[PDB]
Each structure stands twice: as structure tokens, then as C-alpha cells.
Design a protein around this motif. Structure first.
Motif, PDB file in Angstrom:
ATOM      1  N   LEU A   1       2.212  17.656  43.027  1.00  0.00           N
ATOM      2  CA  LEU A   1       3.482  16.975  42.736  1.00  0.00           C
ATOM      3  C   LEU A   1       4.128  16.404  43.981  1.00  0.00           C
ATOM      4  O   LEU A   1       4.153  17.050  45.032  1.00  0.00           O
ATOM      5  N   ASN A   2       4.672  15.204  43.843  1.00  0.00           N
ATOM      6  CA  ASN A   2       5.492  14.545  44.862  1.00  0.00           C
ATOM      7  C   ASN A   2       6.837  14.161  44.235  1.00  0.00           C
ATOM      8  O   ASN A   2       7.004  14.219  43.005  1.00  0.00           O
ATOM      9  N   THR A   3       7.775  13.785  45.094  1.00  0.00           N
ATOM     10  CA  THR A   3       9.077  13.301  44.645  1.00  0.00           C
ATOM     11  C   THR A   3       9.399  12.006  45.376  1.00  0.00           C
ATOM     12  O   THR A   3       8.839  11.707  46.440  1.00  0.00           O
ATOM     13  N   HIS A   4      10.335  11.260  44.811  1.00  0.00           N
ATOM     14  CA  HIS A   4      10.755   9.999  45.410  1.00  0.00           C
ATOM     15  C   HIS A   4      12.229   9.777  45.097  1.00  0.00           C
ATOM     16  O   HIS A   4      12.635   9.993  43.949  1.00  0.00           O
ATOM     17  N   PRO A   5      13.017   9.302  46.085  1.00  0.00           N
ATOM     18  CA  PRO A   5      14.449   9.114  45.869  1.00  0.00           C
ATOM     19  C   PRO A   5      14.804   7.737  45.251  1.00  0.00           C
ATOM     20  O   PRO A   5      15.729   7.068  45.720  1.00  0.00           O
TER      21      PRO A   5
ATOM     22  N   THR B   1       0.183   5.344  46.725  1.00  0.00           N
ATOM     23  CA  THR B   1       1.495   5.880  47.084  1.00  0.00           C
ATOM     24  C   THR B   1       2.501   5.414  46.047  1.00  0.00           C
ATOM     25  O   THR B   1       2.491   4.257  45.630  1.00  0.00           O
ATOM     26  N   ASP B   2       3.340   6.348  45.616  1.00  0.00           N
ATOM     27  CA  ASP B   2       4.418   6.083  44.655  1.00  0.00           C
ATOM     28  C   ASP B   2       3.927   5.526  43.307  1.00  0.00           C
ATOM     29  O   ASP B   2       4.679   4.814  42.639  1.00  0.00           O
ATOM     30  N   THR B   3       2.688   5.863  42.914  1.00  0.00           N
ATOM     31  CA  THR B   3       2.027   5.256  41.733  1.00  0.00           C
ATOM     32  C   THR B   3       1.594   6.204  40.587  1.00  0.00           C
ATOM     33  O   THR B   3       1.317   5.755  39.467  1.00  0.00           O
TER      34      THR B   3
HETATM   35 MG   LIG Z   1       7.457  11.033  48.036  1.00  0.00          MG
END
Ligand SMILES: [Mg+2]
Lengths: 205, 213
Positions: free
Chosen positions: B113-117, B151-153
């Protein structure tokens, strides 16, 4: 920079081409101490929106492209017809023709559209289907200034995507929020005005 | 074929980190009592506050540095082996400053898991908050998503909106988003542990509760 002063008590013209569901919410809201009144509805074709207006005793004007020799001529006519009502604000969210340069010369900064996504995500006519296909969990509605569809954003509100939504169910949930958001944005613009710096629109005091 | 990640509660979580460890702190704070996971290890690629935070909480720390290996592929094999050694059910890599490689993803895709603002697919990249502010949106948010080769996908697991207020600067907006982001990640970890997830296309669907109840 664009400066639109407060106009409450404001005169609103709605331009429409379709079923008038948004017009219904505006007519319902624009009574009593709401800071605007719908003074006229302009249409470019026979549509239910015209009937809804007439049922509410609101004047209806019709400016069909087919009745003019060119789009430039139509632009002059719809601009004159809209200006004839001395509007402070124009809502064109339900209008299915591109407003021309004469109209924008007069009404840029005072003309509002909606979109069923949180712009700049999912632009275009299929924004709901596109959001669903992407698998987002949050989408929303946007109210923005009309320009020559990336105009300054006035207001946004999120809408959840529920597991198992189809395009119709999601689009309907978004439209519910769109109506409330537009009613709130019209009131805020009437009472506060707006200024635009860069592409950021800020409601006044 | 849908990817199906079954429930894993009580789940073992590995956190990969390179920085100040703010998200690690939130996970350590949450992973008490009935919370359906525990942080079993923290992996780092450098000395950092996150490593100090883990140690302060009696969580083992492992270190796999790029420089200590002859190639990126060699490093990928090492960090995969080190992570797998803890038998994790889930890996959080939001604070990790390295792209996870194909060896790692071969084992851990669907569980990482990743997160993005921002509300992906809007405002991808390292300047998502500044870019949202400059564009003049009124609603932004946080996203939790699966890590993949881009990335971010990757498939979106959870999102929550955050308002942009008149007068916000980058730091004020980022604070508001980060608070929501950490909470969203903690909630997504718990839901994944308890319910699992299925991915069809790019659409991730959490498992459902079996009683009201
Ligand atoms: Mg991130």
C-alpha cells in the motif's frame, strides 16, 4: 484580474435545452430571502425546461440557431435576448450549445456551468463513465465559470462511488449534489461577488 | 482472473520507511487492542527517524541499502527476502524513498500500500498539494492505493476528500490533507486485514461484513 461585484438581490437568467431538472431546483430555491430570482429562461429548442419555466410564470425566450444565417448572427441574438433581462448572473449548465464570443464579451465572469466530476479529473461528456472505469472512490460535482471548459472553479463538492454502481446510478447521485451545489454557488456569487487571480476564483466578503 | 487477497486478521504488517516516520507513528498508535493488525517490523534503506521510532517501540528494524549490493536487481532480491522473512500479510511503503522492483512485486503485489495527498488521478507526483492549490480546486483529498510498477497508478483502495479553504498556502493545505491521509491509511489497513480485497480490471473491492450483526 476579473472583478464581479455583489448583485443581491440578483437577477438570474437560466439558459436550457433539456429536461430542466436543475431549473426545478433553482426555481424552488429562488424565493423569499434567497438573494436572487429567476427572471427568465432562454431555450434554443422545444424542451421540458421551457414548460417548467412557463408553469412557474417565468418568461421564456427562444433563440434557435436554425433561425439565423450563421452562428455569429445567432450569438448576437441570444446575447441581446439574454441582456434584455438585465441579468446579474446566467446559468447555462443545461444549455446544449456553445456560447459565442459576443455572449462571453458581455457575460464572462457571470455565466456558470456544472460538471459531474471534480475537475480537472474526468473532463468531457463522459466524466461519470470515466470515473467509474478508473475505480475512484470519490468523485463529485464542479461549478465553474463558462469560457470560450477549464474556466475558473467556483465550487466543488465530493460524492462517493459505491461498490456496484453503474453509470446511471452514479450519475444520478452526482446530479443530486450538482443541484445543491449550483444553488449554493448562485447565492454566494450574488451576495459576495467573485474575483479571479490566475485561474483561482475567490468569493468576496 | 481477479486477484483475491483473503482476510488476514490478526495481520502482520511490515512498514518500509526512509524519512520522518509520521505514518509509522500513526500505525503504531492505532495497532493496539482490537485493531486487526500489528507492526512486526520496519525496513529502511538509510538512517532515519522512522528507524529510531520503531526501535523506541521495540519493533525490529532491518536495513537494506542500495550501496551494499552490486546492482538494483541484487538490492531488489535482498529487500524482498528481508521483507518476506517477517511473513507479512500487508506492507505499507508510503514513506519509502525507493521504487519497489519486480522481484518484490512478484511476491507482494496486492498486499503493498501507498498513499498520495490528492484524489488520484488528479495531481499526481511530488507536488500534488502545490499543484492543486495553484489550479484553484475547492476539493482535494487523500488516496490509498496498491503499489504497482508505475507511480501513482495502482488500484485505488480508499479515498477521502479534503476542502481547500480561502487563504490556504501549501503548508496549511498539506497539513489538512496529511491528517486525513494517515487516518485513511490506518482505516484501509484494518479493512484489508479484516475483509480482504478483490481486484477486477483496476477496480478494487473490499470484502463485506458477514453480519449486521
Ligand atoms: Mg505516495
Amino acid at each position: 484580474p476579473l472583478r464581479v461585484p455583489p448583485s443581491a438581490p440578483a437577477r438570474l437568467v437560466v439558459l436550457a435545452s433539456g429536461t430542466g431538472s436543475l431549473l426545478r431546483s433553482l426555481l424552488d430555491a429562488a424565493v423569499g430571502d434567497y438573494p436572487a430570482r429567476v427572471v427568465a429562461v432562454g431555450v434554443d429548442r422545444e424542451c421540458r425546461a421551457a414548460e417548467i419555466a412557463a408553469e412557474a410564470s417565468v418568461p421564456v425566450f427562444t433563440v434557435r440557431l436554425a433561425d439565423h444565417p450563421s452562428r455569429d448572427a445567432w450569438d448576437v441574438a441570444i446575447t441581446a435576448a439574454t441582456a434584455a433581462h438585465e441579468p446579474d448572473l446566467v446559468v447555462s449548465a443545461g444549455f446544449m450549445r456553445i456560447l459565442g464570443p459576443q455572449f462571453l464579451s458581455r457575460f464572462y465572469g457571470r455565466t456558470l456551468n456544472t460538471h459531474p466530476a471534480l475537475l480537472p479529473a474526468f473532463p468531457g461528456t463522459h466524466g461519470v463513465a470515466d470515473a467509474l472505469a478508473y475505480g475512484v472512490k470519490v468523485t463529485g460535482a464542479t461549478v465553474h465559470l463558462v469560457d470560450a471548459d477549464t474556466g475558473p472553479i467556483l465550487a466543488q463538492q465530493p460524492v462517493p462511488v459505491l461498490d456496484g454502481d453503474d453509470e446511471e446510478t452514479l450519475h444520478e447521485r452526482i446530479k443530486v449534489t450538482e443541484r445543491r451545489l449550483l444553488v449554493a454557488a448562485v447565492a454566494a456569487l450574488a451576495t459576495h461577488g467573485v474575483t479571479v487571480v490566475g485561474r483561482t476564483a475567490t468569493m468576496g466578503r
